[PDB]
Amino acid sequence: ATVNQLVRKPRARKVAKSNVPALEACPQKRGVCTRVYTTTPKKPNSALRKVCRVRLTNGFEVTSYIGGEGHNLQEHSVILIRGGRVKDLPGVRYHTVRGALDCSGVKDRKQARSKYGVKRPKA
Amino acid sequence: SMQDPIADMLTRIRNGQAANKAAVTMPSSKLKVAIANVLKEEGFIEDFKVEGDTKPELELTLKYFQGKAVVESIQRVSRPGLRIYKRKDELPKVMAGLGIAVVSTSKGVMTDRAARQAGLGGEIICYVA
Amino acid sequence: MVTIRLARHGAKKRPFYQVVVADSRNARNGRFIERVGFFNPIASEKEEGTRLDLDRIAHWVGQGATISDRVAALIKEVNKAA
Amino acid sequence: ELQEKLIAVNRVSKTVKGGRIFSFTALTVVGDGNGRVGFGYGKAREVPAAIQKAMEKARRNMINVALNNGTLQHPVKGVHTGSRVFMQPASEGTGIIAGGAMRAVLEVAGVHNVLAKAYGSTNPINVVRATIDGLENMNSPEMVAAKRGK
Amino acid sequence: ARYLGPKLKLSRREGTDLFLKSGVRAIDTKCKIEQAPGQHGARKPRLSDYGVQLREKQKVRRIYGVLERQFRNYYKEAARLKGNTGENLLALLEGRLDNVVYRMGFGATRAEARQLVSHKAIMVNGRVVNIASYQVSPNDVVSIREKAKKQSRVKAALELAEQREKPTWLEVDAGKMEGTFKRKPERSDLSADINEHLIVELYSK
Amino acid sequence: KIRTLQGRVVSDKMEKSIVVAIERFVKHPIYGKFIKRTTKLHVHDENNECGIGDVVEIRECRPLSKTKSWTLVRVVEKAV
RNA sequence: UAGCUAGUAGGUGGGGUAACGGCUCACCUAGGCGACGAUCCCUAGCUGGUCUGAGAGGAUGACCAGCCACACUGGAACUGA
RNA sequence: CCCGCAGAAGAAGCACCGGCUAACUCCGUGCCAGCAGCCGCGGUAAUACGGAGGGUGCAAGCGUUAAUCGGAAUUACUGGGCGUAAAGCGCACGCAGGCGGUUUGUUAAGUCAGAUGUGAAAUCCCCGGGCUCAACCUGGGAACUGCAUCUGAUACUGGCAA
Questions:
Q1: Contact at 8 Å (CB) between D37 and D53?
Q2: In sequence order, what E strands does chain E have?
Q3: Which nucleotides of G are covered by protein (CB under 7 A)?
Q4: Strands across the sheet with F37-40, in order?
Q5: Where are chain B's structural domains?
Q6: How far apart are alpha carbons F7 and B54 in whole angstroms?
Q7: Residue E52, domain extent
Q8: Chain E, 53-92: which have a CB under 8 Å from a chain D CB?
Q9: Domain for residue E176, yes or no?
Q10: In what order do the strands lie in the sheet with B100-104?
Q11: Could you give the domains of chain A?
């Protein structure tokens, strides 16, 4: 383009909306949850995986996946949600926070201790 | 139509050097003879002469040392659609000073060195490789 | 009025004053007209640590400025010589 | 004493009547630490012979690159297919800063410190032969002096 | 801070004597060089370029016994100053008080020199210096006061010091367990095994 | 001396009133082009001397009324 | 978001401020602004600076300084330099 | 801030170990149990899932997330592109803009020199001083990349006349 074309109209950027409609740029929010679900993965892999529907305090309704081994979620309880996305299941972009608020942690886990939030035993 | 003869003959000599000619002819003006004088005093071009009153024209002859060309590259930086202006400290140094720079000053047109001792800023014309 | 007060910029438990001329109604270390000198109370064995410009303060006294107690004691301590 | 070091290796295919049959390729540069740097390219059936073939071919295509002290004199451009490169002297210290598939071809040149960067798409096969002709276009003051007065 | 671990593990992993054990029998039964310990450390690991850089960084770090943050700040300060970066960095690092105490010969290892420093022993200009992060200035005096006098450790260190090379830039002195600092050391006296440029290249990325 | 500016009328005539425009070049802070720029004032005059399309200088003085703050002194190249 | 604006733009005479002033009054003119963004919408206190990148830039206005506008929500003044 | 008391005492954790990127071997699980940032790994031999032992990286902290910039030459001025990929209007004709052949004088509006006033003090930077060492405080310079005025320069554009 020629310089006159620019001085008539300047260049334009891109908004580049982020991947978390959780919005407010807040790393963590609080929810209450309503029920439990199980759904199939996509083609190249196959297993059973657990998710949960959470009705947050901002009027948003989204679904999050729960990692670990076992859980203690039923009806409604208080949990913490963090950033992060799971590529396999279509329609989830959140990870539940293990070992905080009300979601109790896993048992007997020894390797990779910091995550999953369980009181590390000192013997 | 035509918009500048300076760019015209710069492109002409570049293409002539690429095609390995031995003579280039074009009309003349005071700017042309000044730039030719500066180039010849520095020494890229062999010589020049003028002929004709009502339709004067310049002739230039290139320079060779062996089959490799002499004028490695050339381009006009100032365009009739966008001007350039530099202060004393802003005289650019092409090819780490090995090359040359054509600068038009208040005192005339000469190399960058004499401008630097005189400390005068002006116009920029072309970059010779 | 126009006075000559004291202001500090140092860290906790380590003062460092800077004598300046400004308006009375302004803050301690805020708006000021022009710096004139400084004083280091803790100082050291080194001689430096007490400097002024007698000419400017004399001019400002001529224009109609007043004095504070500590700066008056300081200038009496130094004067041209004491 | 000449130096050498491998850069990259990848497989290929032909898919002839019987099925897929393979072969391997290698590329390598050489340098004596005082300029005069060449490269080679060859293919064979297996890597241990492929690299040997590449090095034995690499002895050809020698060039002569003028160098000053330990840094390159003036900037230089470089273009080939779809890659472009840029360089700058940065006299003394700071070592050499450059991207991958560029470090080796410059290291054997002998320059102990230089600054450079490559533009655009950077497939290693194409990127090489850019610094080569870039150094080929280089001029030291003696040559330009040899055509203009002093 | 500090390492607090099996030192000859790092001696063996690096592949060269690290001068940090410094007993009397500098012999094989102590070290077992060229083994690269671990479960199956017999295999050659086939280093890469980034690995070469990281290993050189590990060697230069462990030889002088410093953590990471201090090293990064040292590189920042060296780069801020004029001159060649690598030489300036090595000269600056050499100026640490513990290293010059070791080189004077009042100890056997740098770590024990630091242990001596932390316990209020070394004396300068009639004033105690607490920490080994101190930067010595040209034309200073290193000495030991009388509370730590008549300790056999310093005498043993003095007797075993002569096996080293007594670098020229520092005056050996030690007539009455007293010394004198002269100038900044330079490239010639220090060992030529260390390659400066690679560290700078590593921090480039 | 007294600072002056030169301009062009391109304006109708009200009772004791003319409008003037002035021009000057400037370097754009981004692309380096030079673009003509126009600014407009209002003037208080005397005896409505000047006419449409005339060149006249100008100088500032006490604020007289809204948007009217400059007055003329001399007129050069009378008429077109 | 393509046409906006009658005390709106000037002139004449009176009244009111520390002062010129459509700051207000009665009269006379037919105007002023606009494609080099007027009116109309959504959004935000402003700088010396901060962060980042080599430079150009790009986001940002936390504390410390400078200046404004604000004291339950709407409006008025007395008093006083 | 100094001096004294037998006193090893009273004091270490956290991530990773297929490529991207430093470091691996066994047992149980066997499209279930599951990870993961992209490639994707799992049906009987997992250097990737769970445990054990070793190794690797930082350490009074280490990992997870949220947000900003460069890697991005992926808004391209310094620095990209339009035959076949995302891209040249269906063609012409012409206001408002932009840009102009070639001489000689005049003009100082651009532009360039020199001086003056002004770009508040912190910070950013360089020589030093001090708190046992730095963090932190501070003495003197440096730039605030402009603005305005005055005196000069006339090769190139600009206004003038032939």
A1: no
A2: 122-124, 127-128, 143-144
A3: 9-11, 20-23, 28-29, 31-34, 36, 54, 57-59, 65-67
A4: F37-40, F21-24, F5-8, F55-65, F68-71, F43-44
A5: 1-71, 72-129
A6: 41
A7: 7-93+190-203
A8: 83-86
A9: yes
A10: B74-76, B123-128, B100-104, B109-110
A11: 1-123 (2.40.50.140)
